[PDB]
C-alpha cells in the first residue's frame, strides 16, 4: 500500500545515486512509493530540454516503471485549489507545480518525500520527509 | 465523443453567461466538451479565495456536473513536458497551468477553447478556438 509520494528532486537524486542516501532509502521502501503525473511532467521536461533527449527519456521511462504514477484527478485538483487559496490568505509562496504535488499527496493521505522541506511545510495538513 | 477542452476563462464566461456568445456555443456543443482537472483546480482556487466561497463552490459544483472532467494522466504529462521544452527553446512564454492544459488537450487530440489565443497559439500542434 502506498505511503510516499516522491517529489521531482527526490526522483532525480535516486536516478543519479546522488546524494547516495536517497537511492538507499528508496530501496528500503519499494512497493510503497509513487509520483504524481505532475512530477512525471517535470521529469519529461528535464529530459526533452537536455542535450541527450532520447537517452534521458529512456532513463525516466525505466525509473517510473518501477513505481506507480498517479493521475492528477478531481480530488487532487480540489485539494490543490483549497491549498492555493489558504496560501494566498497567509501570504505564503509555493511554486505552481509544488502546489499541485502537495494537493495530490494530501488528497491521497501520502507523505511527500522532498528536499524542499520549508516550502512544502507552508502547506497545511501535509507530512513530509527528506531522504538526502 | 469529446471534441473540445475548455480553458478556465472560458468556463467562467460560460458560468457568468457573459460574454453570452460563450454560453451560446457551449449549449450547441453539449456532450462534446470537457475540462482538464487542471482547470478544475483553478476554478476551486477562485471560489475558495472569493468573498462568497460556499456559494461560488456550489456554482462550480453545478457547472462541473454538466461537463466531463478529465484526469491529467501520464500522456498529458508527457505532452506537457515536450511542450515546455519546445517553448523554452523558442523563448515563448506560457503560464504554468496553461502549459499543462495545452499538453492535456494535445494528448487527447482536443481543440483548446480559450480567450487567451496569444498564449496558446505559441504551442505547437495545437488547435484552438475562441468563443468570446
Among A38, A77, A96, which would you mutate to test the B interface (most chain B Cβ atoms within 10 Å of its Cβ)? A77
For residue A23, what are the domain limits? 1-132
- The experimental method, as deposited, was X-ray
C-alpha cell at B43: 476554478
HEC secondary structure over chain A: CCCEEECHHHHHHHHHCCCHHHHHHHHHCCCCEEEEHHHHHHHHHHHHCCCCHHHHHHHHHHHHCCCEEECECHHHHHHHHHHHHHHHHHCCCCCHHHHHHHHHHHHCCCEEECCCHHHHCCCCCCCEECCC
Instruction: Find out whether B121 and B104 touch, Cβ atoms under 8 Å.
Output: no
Report CB contact under 8 Å: A77, B44: yes
Rounded distance between C-alpha atoms, residue B97 and residue B40, angstroms: 11
Contacting residues of A for B42, CB less than 8 Å apart: 81
3-state secondary structure (DSSP) of residue B74: helix
- What are the residues facing A70 on neighbouring strands? A36
Burial A53-66 (b: 16+ CB within 10 A, else e): eeebbebbeeebee
Rounded distance between C-alpha atoms, residue A103 and residue B97, angstroms: 15
Q: The domain spanning residue A100 has which CATH number?
A: 3.40.50.1010
By CB neighbour count within 10 A (0-12 exposed, 13-18 middle, 19+ buried), where does A79 fall?
buried
Instruction: Find out whether A93 and B94 touch, Cβ atoms under 8 Å.
Output: no
Instruction: Find out whether B33 and A72 touch, Cβ atoms under 8 Å.
Output: no
Reference A111, options A2, A20, A30, A26; nearest CA is: A2
Q: Is the CB of B97 inside 8 Å of chain A's CB atoms?
A: yes
How many domains, in total, are found in chain B? 1
Rounded distance between C-alpha atoms, residue A115 and residue A97, angstroms: 15
Rounded distance between C-alpha atoms, residue B81 and residue A47, angstroms: 8
State the residue for C-alpha cell 454538466: B66
Work out the minimum CA distance from A45 to partner chain B, whole angstroms: 4
Rounded distance between C-alpha atoms, residue B7 and residue B25, angstroms: 14
Q: Is the CB of B52 inside 8 Å of chain A's CB atoms?
A: no
- What are the residues facing A112 on neighbouring strands? A5, A128
DSSP state of B72: B
Distances (CA, A) of B35 to A49, A67, A96, B109: 28, 28, 19, 13
DSSP state of B28: H
Q: At what angle do helices B53-64 and B8-16 cross, to 10 degrees?
A: 100
Task: List all residues 6 or more positions away from A61 whose beta carbon is below 8 Å from its beta carbon.
Answer: none
3-state secondary structure (DSSP) of residue B86: helix
Instruction: Find out whether A5 and A101 touch, Cβ atoms under 8 Å.
Output: yes
Report CB contact under 8 Å: B77, A41: yes
Among A11, A12, A35, A44, which would you mutate to test the B interface (most chain B Cβ atoms within 10 Å of its Cβ)? A44
Q: Is the peptide bond before B105 cis (omega within 30 degrees of 0)?
A: no
What is the Cα A79 distance to its own chain's centre? Answer: 15
Reference B5, options B118, B98, B119; nearest CA is: B98
**What element of type H or E holds B120?**
helix B117-120
* Pairing status of strand A4-6 against strand A111-113: parallel
Q: Quick one: CA dihedral B128, A49, A35, A112, positive or negative?
A: negative
Report CB contact under 8 Å: B71, A71: yes
Instruction: Find out whether A2 and A108 touch, Cβ atoms under 8 Å.
Output: yes
DSSP state of B110: P
For residue A28, the tally of other CB atoms under 10 A from its CB is: 9
CA-based radius of gyration for chain B: 14
Distances (CA, A) of A80 to A123, B39, B89, B114: 10, 11, 29, 22
Task: List all residues 6 or more positions away from B110 whose beta carbon is below 8 Å from its beta carbon.
Answer: B2, B3, B4, B5, B34
Rounded distance between C-alpha atoms, residue A82 and residue B47, angstroms: 9
Reference B32, options B129, B117, B132, B125; nearest CA is: B129
Report CB contact under 8 Å: B84, A43: no
Q: Is the peptide bond before A28 cis (omega within 30 degrees of 0)?
A: no
Contacting residues of B for A77, CB less than 8 Å apart: 37-38, 40-41, 44
Minimum CA–CA partner of A73 in chain B: B71
Q: Is the CB of B132 inside 8 Å of chain A's CB atoms?
A: no
Report CB contact under 8 Å: B77, A44: yes
Amino acid at each position: 500500500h502506498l505511503k510516499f509520494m516522491l517529489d521531482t528532486n527526490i526522483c532525480i537524486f535516486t536516478i543519479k545515486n546522488k546524494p547516495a542516501s536517497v537511492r538507499e532509502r528508496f530501496n528500503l521502501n519499494q512497493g510503497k512509493m509513487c509520483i504524481s503525473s505532475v512530477t512525471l511532467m517535470e521529469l519529461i521536461y528535464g529530459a526533452e530540454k537536455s542535450q541527450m533527449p532520447e537517452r534521458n527519456l529512456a532513463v525516466i521511462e525505466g525509473f517510473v516503471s518501477r513505481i506507480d504514477v498517479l493521475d492528477y484527478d478531481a480530488a487532487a485538483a480540489t485539494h490543490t485549489g483549497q491549498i492555493r487559496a489558504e496560501l494566498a490568505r497567509q501570504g505564503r509562496p509555493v511554486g505552481p507545480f509544488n502546489q499541485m504535488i502537495a494537493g495530490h499527496a494530501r488528497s491521497r493521505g501520502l507523505i511527500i518525500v522532498t528536499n524542499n522541506t520549508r516550502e512544502f511545510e507552508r502547506v497545511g495538513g501535509l507530512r513530509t520527509e527528506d531522504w538526502s
